[PDB]
Design a protein around this ligand. Structure first.
Ligand SMILES: [Ca+2]
Length: 448
């Protein structure tokens, strides 16, 4: 019949694993710790210029640490460095990368200084690039300290003028130290696009357009590039959507057993309900994927590779791709909004970090804690301590990783700007994770 089973030689976030999450999630093993409201502060140095040209307090969102090749937090001439998306809510659709820095031993949020924006608004027009001139926003990515001791950034070039086109982009950030307690961004070089989708393995913005995306409610993604090295090879892992040959979006996807898991009765009943309901469109269009490309030594595209994992029928958005090696195993994480999911029992208030483990980088990823659930955040978006963009930072030693995130901090009474959330620990052991109880760290802490 119309029923089939195609894995496309890749792993999947299955409906069966997802349906089990609501009954599993109400547990301190998985719940993002409650944060103390009275202790929360804005990032003090987080000040810049609005569109009007006046200096204001910035909102600070997605942030990522400068990492060593294996994912550990780098030290750059005595400083830890964090790249953060920031902006003025009166520009709203304006997002730029900022460089924050702190002496390695310092702990407090007040110790974080701001070297300012990585890019000047003129920087994107300088190189001979196919895409950069059309950029409207700087979206998330990663930072790596090279062998050569260079600061190498990866970020997302977003073009709202080109229908929301998203390009994986790289640049070397040139740094200097004016004095012993200051870092300065000198400017950028090696500033070039890397990848914007191929069409067969990863969806292009043109396919999104052609299929009438803005009408259908489709969501096109090609963002959050995360740098990783393995066996001498260099890779980016990133948020994307499937292409025409690795399980394309559409109604046929609802007949593909690979996306359901469980038994035949489960598949038959779940499919029936999907094809019937108001979720039929949402599910059909849902084709999120965690993609992977290999880079050359100059950080240009070497090879477009098949996705590590997809979330067909489940969601169109698995964000903040993250991956590292621990204990000889490969751990893959992604954040997800319940509002973007099609799963019964998962609501608009639900926000997750999901997690998967494989013995090899491109091998089969199996769900952590049987379902994939690692973190659950369900605080209302109006709560002061709402957190988002949860990210696992691997540590030099020990079984714990540091979870960083931002805190929207939208209080009636100050402080009241998006800031670093207090960090915390998650214990990793085999295919099983747990929030380390009562070990809340400082806002924006990277290492323990
Ligand atoms: Ca889609």
């Amino acid at each position: 019949s119309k029923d089939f089973n195609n894995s496309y030689g890749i792993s999947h976030i299955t409906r069966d694993n997802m349906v089990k999450i609501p009954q599993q999630q109400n547990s301190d093993q998985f719940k993002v710790p409650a944060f103390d409201e009275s202790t929360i502060k804005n990032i003090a140095s987080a000040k810049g210029k609005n569109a009007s040209g006046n200096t204001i307090d910035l909102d600070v969102w997605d942030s990522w640490p400068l990492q060593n090749a294996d994912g550990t937090v780098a030290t750059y001439h005595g400083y830890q460095i964090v790249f953060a998306l920031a902006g003025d809510p009166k520009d709203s659709n304006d997002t730029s990368v900022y460089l924050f820095y702190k002496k390695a031993g310092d702990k407090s949020i007040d110790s974080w200084k701001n070297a300012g924006r990585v890019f000047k608004d003129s920087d994107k027009f300088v190189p001979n690039d196919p895409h950069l001139k059309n950029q409207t926003q700087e979206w998330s990515g990663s930072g790596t300290l090279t062998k050569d001791g260079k600061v190498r950034l990866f970020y997302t070039d977003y073009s709202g003028k080109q229908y929301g086109k998203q390009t994986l982009t790289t640049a070397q950030v040139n740094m200097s130290q004016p004095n012993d307690n200051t870092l300065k961004v000198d400017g950028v070089e090696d500033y070039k696009s890397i990848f914007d989708g191929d069409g067969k393995i990863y969806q292009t913005v043109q396919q999104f357009i052609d299929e009438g995306g803005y009408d259908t409610g489709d969501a096109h993604t090609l963002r959050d590039p995360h740098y990783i090295e393995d066996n001498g090879h260099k890779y980016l892992v990133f948020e994307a959507n499937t292409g025409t040959e690795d399980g394309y979006q559409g109604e046929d996807s609802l007949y593909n057993r690979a996306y359901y898991g469980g038994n035949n009765p489960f598949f038959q009943s779940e499919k029936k309900k999907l094809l019937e309901g108001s979720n039929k469109e949402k599910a059909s269009l849902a084709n999120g994927a965690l993609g992977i490309i290999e880079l050359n030594d100059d950080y240009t595209l070497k090879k477009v590779m098949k996705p590590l994992i997809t979330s067909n029928t489940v969601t169109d958005e698995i964000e903040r791709a993250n991956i590292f090696k621990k204990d000889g195993k490969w751990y893959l994480f992604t954040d997800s909004r319940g509002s973007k999911m099609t799963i019964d029992g998962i609501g608009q208030d639900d926000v997750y970090m999901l997690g998967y483990v494989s013995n090899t980088l491109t091998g089969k990823y199996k769900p952590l804690n049987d379902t994939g659930l690692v973190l659950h955040m369900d605080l209302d978006p109006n709560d002061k301590t709402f957190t988002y963009s949860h990210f696992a930072v691997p540590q030099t030693k020990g079984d714990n990783v540091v979870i960083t995130s931002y805190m929207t901090n939208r209080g009636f009474y100050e402080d009241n700007h998006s800031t670093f959330a207090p960090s915390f620990l998650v214990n990793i052991d085999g295919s099983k994770t747990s929030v380390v109880k009562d070990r809340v760290l400082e806002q924006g802490q990277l290492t323990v």
